[PDB]
Amino acid sequence: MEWIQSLPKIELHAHLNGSIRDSTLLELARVLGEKGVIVFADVEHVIQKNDRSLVEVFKLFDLIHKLTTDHKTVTRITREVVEDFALENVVYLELRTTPKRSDSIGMSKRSYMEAVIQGLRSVSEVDIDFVTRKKIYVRLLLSIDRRETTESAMETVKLALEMRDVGVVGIDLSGNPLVGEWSTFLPALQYAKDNDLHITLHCGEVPNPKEIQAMLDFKPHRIGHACFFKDEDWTKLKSFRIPVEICLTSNIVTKSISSIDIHHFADLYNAKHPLILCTNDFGVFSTSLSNEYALAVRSLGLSKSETFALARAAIDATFAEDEVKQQLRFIFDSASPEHV
Numbered sequence: 001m002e003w004i005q006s007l008p009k010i011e012l013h014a015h016l017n018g019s020i021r022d023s024t025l026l027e028l029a030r031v032l033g034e035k036g037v038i039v040f041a042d043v044e045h046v047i048q049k050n051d052r053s054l055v056e057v058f059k060l061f062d063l064i065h066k067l068t069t070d071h072k073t074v075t076r077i078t079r080e081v082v083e084d085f086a087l088e089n090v091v092y093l094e095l096r097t098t099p100k101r102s103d104s105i106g107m108s109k110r111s112y113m114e115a116v117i118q119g120l121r122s123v124s125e126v127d128i129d130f131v132t133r134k135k136i137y138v139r140l141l142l143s144i145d146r147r148e149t150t151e152s153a154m155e156t157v158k159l160a161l162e163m164r165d166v167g168v169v170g171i172d173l174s175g176n177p178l179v180g181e182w183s184t185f186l187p188a189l190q191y192a193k194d195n196d197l198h199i200t201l202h203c204g205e206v207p208n209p210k211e212i213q214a215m216l217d218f219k220p221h222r223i224g225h226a227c228f229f230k231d232e233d234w235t236k237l238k239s240f241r242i243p244v245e246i247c248l249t250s251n252i253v254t255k256s257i258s259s260i261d262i263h264h265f266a267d268l269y270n271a272k273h274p275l276i277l278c279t280n281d282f283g284v285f286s287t288s289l290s291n292e293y294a295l296a297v298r299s300l301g302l303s304k305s306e307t308f309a310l311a312r313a314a315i316d317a318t319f320a321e322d323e324v325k326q327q328l329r330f331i332f333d334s335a336s337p338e339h340v
């Protein structure tokens, strides 16, 4: 109802460039329109009308990236995303982002991520811890996009290892699940995992039985979505105890799951398999982590107490150092008496 907004929450699946304020997106559009680099009306149209089906969504990202791939803008949206999550009482955020190259502006994967760090340093409206009045803990995941080559994925992994000193804790594989081959990414993800980086994989967003099995056989630390798992995939997932990042609004909008009332998050909850409610792209899908909790609470008929326990259970699914997980345990214990 309202307590959901004040519930302390852990966000483990938020893509930076999918988490942008509507007003920031259109302001950036209007300036590039007035600079004559795009045609505002067309861009405004696609932000408005793109149906956010899995096919259309990747087109919308191509558009966003034309608006947002500049150092000053990366800093700006990093700051705004952290403020927005902190303001709805997210107390721990793993923020994922694909590092970009853009030669025309001398942007490298490293200089892109330096702009992210500058964003974190610029956070002022809330207290931030991003390496060891609202307080938020922020840690970073570098995304590998399924359009990338093995060597490009390796550059991302090497950059992640170098940036462990500013809160990088893991690697994601994401982007269009119709593009690329697991065999391209497996070798870079193996190098990451062997160098003690934590790994989350987008898995089963489309039917792909051999890819789902190969991602499960890799034993990543988390998976996202799991929309087109078959019974053989659930049995292996449950045996391997790999937590699932559940993206309720995302999965309904993209037509990946036909309704909340058949969503697998209820089978997992009942089976006592770890799951974490996530926004995925709260900008693209017009939601908030409080709203994700609201949709789950009504669908499962959870009490305040059951809902609190589910939120707290996310702590051991974080990629944070033990010190931070201990701080989160303190934060949850302090709030427990307020949740029936």
Ligand SMILES: O=c1[nH]cnc2c1ncn2[C@@H]1O[C@H](COP(=O)(O)O)[C@@H](O)[C@H]1O
Binding pocket: 015, 016, 017, 018, 061, 096, 097, 098, 099, 143, 145, 174, 175, 176, 177, 202, 205, 250, 280, 281
């Ligand atoms: O639902 C999703 N499925 C797959 N990839 C996604 C999804 N949402 C966001 N992404 C990825 O995240 C990127 C947007 O955030 P960025 O990494 O900060 O540029 C997109 O270009 C995709 O690669």
Ligand SMILES: [Zn+2]
Binding pocket: 174, 202, 224, 280
């Ligand atoms: Zn996603």
